[PDB]
C-alpha cells in the first residue's frame, strides 16, 4: 500500500538505517564502483526520499522501490563500460528489469581479500572518522557478498562499532579488540555459508524436506503452540526461505517483516518469550525473533505411544494424509525434545515413516509397528554418546591437545585431504568442542549441530571442485540429515600409501619461537599432519612420543643461549630418531 513507498520506508527505518541500507543495496549491485560514488548515490537517493517524506505527492514519489532503484542504477554513467551486459538490463520493463539486475550480481567479483590492519591503525582511523570508517567496510563487505541479507550486515556493523568503541580506549587495545574481530569475522563467514547452504539444500532436497526441518525447529522453539499454528508458521517460513533464496532484498525483507508481524500479533498462540522483541523496530524484529530462546514446554506432556503406536487409527490416520501425520509426529517429538538436534528428529521421523510404510501394508499393522519406539533409542544414543566421549576427551585434554587428537584421527581417515584443510577443520572442530561442551547436556546436541553444520559445510565447499576422496563427496552430497553421521562413519584409510619423507617439511627454525600463539600452533599442527601422512601406521602412542621429543626440542632450544643452530643440529637428531622410532 502507501502512496509513497520510499517515504514509508524512510519513516519506518529512520534516516540513518535507510542510508546504510541504500548503501548496501547499491554496493551489492555496483560491486565495482568506488566508495565515494556510492556515497554520492546514497545522498542523492536520501535527499529524494526526504522530498517524499515531506510530501508523498511530490514528483516520482509514488513510484515503486524497484522502479526507483532500477532507474537510479540506470543513470550510472559507466554502467556498460564497467558492468557490460548488466547495462542491458536498463532496456527492460521494470519487472523484468529487476530480475535481470538480480541475475547479474557477481557472487565472486574477484576483489582482493580484506586484510585486518594493525590495531593502532584501525583505532586511529576509527577515531578520525567512525562514520566513514564503518561505512567504508560495510561497502567492502557488501560488494564482496551480494546476496548477504542487507539488514543482517547492519547488525554486524553495530557490533563492530561497539568493539572499536570499547577496545580503542582500553589499556590493552589489541587484547580487547582482536578476539572480538575474530568472533565477528567467524560469525560473518558462517552466516554467509549458512545462508548459501540453506538455499542449496532447498534446491537439492526439495520443499518437503525443508518443511520437515521447519516443523521440527519451530516445534522445539514454540512447544506450547498448537500443531495447526506450527503448520501455518512452516508454510510462511517456507515462503520466506524460498523467496529470500531468490535473492531480492525487498521481497525477502517484506516477507520476513510480514512473518515477524504475524508472529508478534499472535504471541499468545506461539510463545511467551517474544514480548521484548515484538516491541522492537520493524528492522530488527525478524532477526531477533530468529534468535529467541525456546519457550518452556508444557508440563508433563503425555508419551507419543498413545497416538502414534497404541491408537487403532494409526495407519488410517497416516494413510489419509501422510505428510500431515508425519508432521504431527515430528511436532510432538520435537516440542518434547529441544535437547535433540533437528537432524536427529528428522532421522526419527524418517524411521517412523519407513516403519509405517512397511507395516501399514501388513495384514496386522499394530503387531508390526508396535515396537517402533525401540528403533529410536540407538539413533538418539549415537549423538548423545559421541558428545559425551568428545566433551569428556576435551575436558581432560584442553582445546589445543584436543584439536591435535582430532588432527591425527582425521588425517588417518582421509590422508588425501590437503594439510591446510586438515589443520583448519581439526582446529575448528576443536573449537566447537570448546564452545558446546560448556553447555549442560540438555543443550549440547543442538549446539553441536549448529556449529558442525558450519564446519562441515566449509569442508564440503572446499572439497567441492577440489575433491580428493569419493567418501568425502558421498558425505557431502548425501542427505543433510545423514551428513554428520556419514563423516563420523569414515574409517581409517588402509589403502593409503605413506607420503615420501620431505626434509624441508620437517625442518624447524628459531622463528618458531617468535610466532604468535596461533601461528605457532598452526606450524606444529601442520607438522603433525605431515608426520601422520608420512607415517600413517604410527600409533597415537608412538606419535605422542615423537611429539614429546619435538616439544622438548623446541622448548629446550628456544630458551637456550644464542642458538639458531640448536634447531638445525638438534633438529637433525630429532628427525633421525623419529624416523627410527616410527620405522
Ligand atoms: C561495517 C561493519 C562490518 C560488517 C557488517 C562486516 C561484516 C563482515 C562479514 C559478514 C564477514 C565475513 C564474510 C565472508 O563470508 O567471507 C567479514 C569478514 C572480515 N572482516 Fe568485516 N565487517 C565489518 C567491519 C570490519 C572492519 C571495520 C574490519 C577491519 C578493520 C573488518 C575486517 C574483516 C576481515 C579481516 C574479515 C575476514 C576477510 C577474509 O577472511 O577474507 N570488518 N566482515
Ligand atoms: C506442515 C507439516 C509438514 C510435514 C513435513 C513432512 C515430514 C516428513 C518427515 C520425514 C522426514 C524426512 C527427512 C528428510 O527430508 O531428509
Ligand atoms: C534504494 C532503496 C533502498 C530501500 C531500503 C531497503 C529496505 C530495507 C528493508 C529492511 C527491513 C528488514 C526487516 C526484516 O528483516 O524483517
Ligand atoms: C579435512 C577432512 C576432515 C574429515 C574428518 C571428518 C569430519 C569430522 C566429523 C564430524 C565431527 C563429529 C564429532 C566427533 O569428532 O566425534
Ligand atoms: C569435533 C568435536 C565435537 C564436539 C561436540 C560433539 C559432537 C558430537 C556429534 C553431535 C552431532 C549432533 C547432530 C546430529 O544429530 O548429527
Ligand atoms: C620425520 C620426523 C619429524 C619429527 C618432528 C615432528 C613434528 C611434529 C610436531 C608435533 C606437534 C605437537 C604439539 C606440541 O608439542 O605443541
UniProtKB/Swiss-Prot annotation:
Changing residue 312 to N: In Canterbury/New Guinea/Tagliacozzo/Cuneo/Cooperstown. Changing residue 81 to K: In Vibo Valentia. The modification N6-methyllysine is found at residue 533. Cu cation binds at residue 2. Glycated in diabetic patients. Phosphorylated by FAM20C in the extracellular medium. PROSITE patterns: ALBUMIN_1, ALBUMIN_2. Its main location: secreted. The modification Phosphoserine is found at residues 4, 57, 64, 272, 418, 488. Changing residue 353 to K: In Hiroshima-1. Ca(2+) 1 binds at residues 5, 243, 248, 251. Zn(2+) binds at residues 66, 246, 248. The modification Phosphothreonine is found at residues 82, 419, 421. Residues 1-185, 186-378, 379-576 form the Albumin domain. Interacts with FCGRT; this interaction regulates ALB homeostasis. Interacts with TASOR. In plasma, occurs in a covalently-linked complex with chromophore-bound alpha-1-microglobulin with molar ratio 1:2 and 1:1; this interaction does not prevent fatty acid binding to ALB. Binds water, Ca(2+), Na(+), K(+), fatty acids, hormones, bilirubin and drugs. Its main function is the regulation of the colloidal osmotic pressure of blood. Major zinc transporter in plasma, typically binds about 80% of all plasma zinc. Major calcium and magnesium transporter in plasma, binds approximately 45% of circulating calcium and magnesium in plasma. Potentially has more than two calcium-binding sites and might additionally bind calcium in a non-specific manner. Belongs to the ALB/AFP/VDB family. This is Albumin. It comes from Homo sapiens.
